[PDB]
Design a binder for this molecule. Structure first.
Ligand SMILES: O=c1ccn([C@H]2C[C@H](O)[C@@H](COP(=O)(O)O)O2)c(=O)[nH]1
Ligand SMILES: O=c1ccn([C@H]2C[C@H](O)[C@@H](COP(=O)(O)O)O2)c(=O)[nH]1
Lengths: 260, 259
C-alpha cells in the first residue's frame, strides 16, 4: 500500500552518504525494489501531488519514436527543453530505441510492436523485452537512458511489467517513472487483451539528494489516500491513443511539494 | 543467509503453473542479495560444478564466439548449441568485449566499466549490456543474464545482474557464482573491496521435471560458504583458471541434472 514511501523511508534512514555528478550530496542504496498490484489502484502518488499531464504526454511522445521536442511543445510540455538542440533534437533517446532500434541490416526494430505481438501470440515468452540501452548510440543521446530496460510477463490473463532503472532521484524523478510505466502497462494490457497485474520497479543507484531531506520528511509524515483509477478509451492500436483517451479518476492527493 | 534456497522454496510453494516443452512453476521479478564480504556464494546444498563456471566466465572475458577454447579445457556446457564449426554467434562475450557501434567501431564494455570504476566510482552509468537488440537473431539463443551494473560506496564494489529468464535449479547456481566471481575480479582490478551481489530476475521458474531434485536440495542443511582467493594480475583479461582458488568448499553431494 505504500511501496514508494517505504522505499523512500528506507533510503532516508539507511542510505550511505555518496558524492554525485551534480555536486549535490546524496544518501543512496543499490539494488532496491518496489512492487505495485495495478489491479488495486493506479500508483500516481497521493502523499504529494504529481503532475500527470507531463507524464502522459511524455509517454505518448516516446511511443511516437520521436527525437524532437516539437510535438511535446505543441502540448505545453517543456520538461525536455533544457537538453534539446537549436533544431529541437535530442539524439536517439528512449522512444527512438523503443520504435526504431537500428539493426546491422540497415533496418529498424520496433520493440513495442514486437512485444505486443509476443503478448498476443506467445504470452509465456520469457523474451518480451524492450531495451533503450543502445551501447553504440548512447553518446549521440542528449542524456544516457535512465529507465533503461523493461520486461513483460503474463500469468492468468494478467500482464506484469518490470522496469530496470539504473539511477533514481527518489524524491523528484521516481514518482514520474512509476506513473509512466504503470500507464504503459495499462496501454499494453488493453492492446494485448489482458488485464493488469504487477508493476515491479527495480533500481540501480537509488538516492535521496541532500537538498530534498526536509521535503522527504514532510512527505513521509502524510497518510496516503486511496489510489486513483486509470481508465482508457477504446483504441485498436497503442499508437493511436491520445491524451484525451486517458482518465485519472478520483485522484485525491496531498498538496504538491516544490523542490529547491 | 540462504537467499537462493529461500527463493527456490518460495517459487516451489507459490509459483504459477505454466508452459513453454516442459512446464514450470513461475514467479516474476524476484530478487536475491549476497553480501560478498561474508563468503563466496558457491552453493553448499549441492556440489556446484565450479570448473564450468570459472571457465565459462574466462571465455566470456575473451570475447570468444566459438566454443573451441572451452573444449580445450574440458567444458561441454555450450556444446548443445554450437555450429559444426563450433560458432555460436555474437553471444555474451562478443557483446561485452566488442559491441558493434554504428560507427564501425567496437565497444569494449568491460574496459569501459573498469575505467569508470577507477576514474569515476560514483558513476551511476557503469553498465554492461549483452542485450543487443539488432544481434539477438544471430545468436544461438538470446542472452539470459542480459545485463549488469556496478556501484561503489565506501570503497566497496557492488554488482547487480538483471536476468530475464532463470532456470532456478540448473542455471541460477551458475549465474550467482559467475557474477560473484566477476565482481571479485573487477574489485581487485579497481583496488576495491567486494560489496554486494544483487540478483534480479524476470521469469523465475522451476521446471516440472526438477521438483524431486529441488526437494532433495531443500531438505539439506546449508553449510558455511567457501572463500575466494584471486592471485594477483595486472589486468582482468590476464586471470587464468589457476588464479582462482575456492578455499573451504564443503558442499553436499552433487545432484544430477535429470534427463
Ligand atoms: O527518468 C529519470 C531520469 C533521471 N532521473 C534522475 C536520476 C539521477 O539523479 C539523475 C540523472 O543523473 P545520472 O545518473 O545520469 O548521473 O536524474 C530519474 O530519477 N528518473
Ligand atoms: O545463464 C542462464 C542461461 C539460461 N538459463 C535458463 C532460463 C531458461 O529456462 C532457459 C532459457 O530459455 P528461454 O527463457 O530463452 O526460453 O535457460 C538460465 O537459467 N541461466
Amino acid at each position: 500500500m505504500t511501496p514508494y514511501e517505504d522505499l523512500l523511508r528506507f533510503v532516508l534512514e539507511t542510505g550511505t552518504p555518496k558524492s554525485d555528478r551534480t555536486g549535490t550530496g546524496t544518501r543512496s542504496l543499490f539494488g532496491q525494489q518496489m512492487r505495485y498490484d495495478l489491479s488495486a489502484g493506479f500508483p500516481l502518488l497521493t502523499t504529494k501531488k504529481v503532475h500527470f499531464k507531463s507524464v502522459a504526454y511524455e509517454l505518448l511522445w516516446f511511443l511516437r519514436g520521436d527525437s524532437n521536442i516539437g510535438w511535446l511543445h505543441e502540448h505545453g510540455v517543456t520538461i525536455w527543453d533544457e537538453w534539446a538542440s537549436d533544431t529541437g533534437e535530442l539524439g536517439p533517446i528512449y522512444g527512438v530505441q523503443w520504435r526504431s532500434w537500428p539493426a546491422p541490416s540497415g533496418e529498424h526494430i520496433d520493440q513495442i510492436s514486437a512485444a505486443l505481438d509476443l503478448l498476443r501470440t506467445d504470452p509465456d515468452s520469457r523474451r518480451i523485452i524492450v531495451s533503450a540501452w543502445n551501447v553504440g548510440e548512447i553518446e549521440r543521446m542528449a542524456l544516457p537512458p535512465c529507465h533503461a530496460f523493461f520486461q513483460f510477463y503474463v500469468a492468468d490473463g494478467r500482464l506484469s511489467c518490470q522496469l530496470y532503472q539504473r539511477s533514481a532521484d527518489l524524491f523528484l524523478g521516481v514518482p514520474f517513472n512509476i506513473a509512466s510505466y504503470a500507464l504503459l502497462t495499462h496501454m499494453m494490457a488493453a492492446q494485448a487483451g489482458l488485464s493488469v497485474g504487477e508493476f515491479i520497479w527495480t533500481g540501480g543507484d537509488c538516492h535521496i539528494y541532500d537538498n530534498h531531506v526536509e521535503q522527504v520528511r514532510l512527505q513521509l509524515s502524510r497518510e496516503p489516500r486511496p489510489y486513483p483509477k486509470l481508465l482508457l478509451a477504446d483504441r485498436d492500436s497503442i499508437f493511436e491513443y491520445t491524451y484525451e483517451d486517458i482518465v485519472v479518476k478520483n485522484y485525491d492527493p496531498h498538496p504538491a511539494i516544490k523542490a529547491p
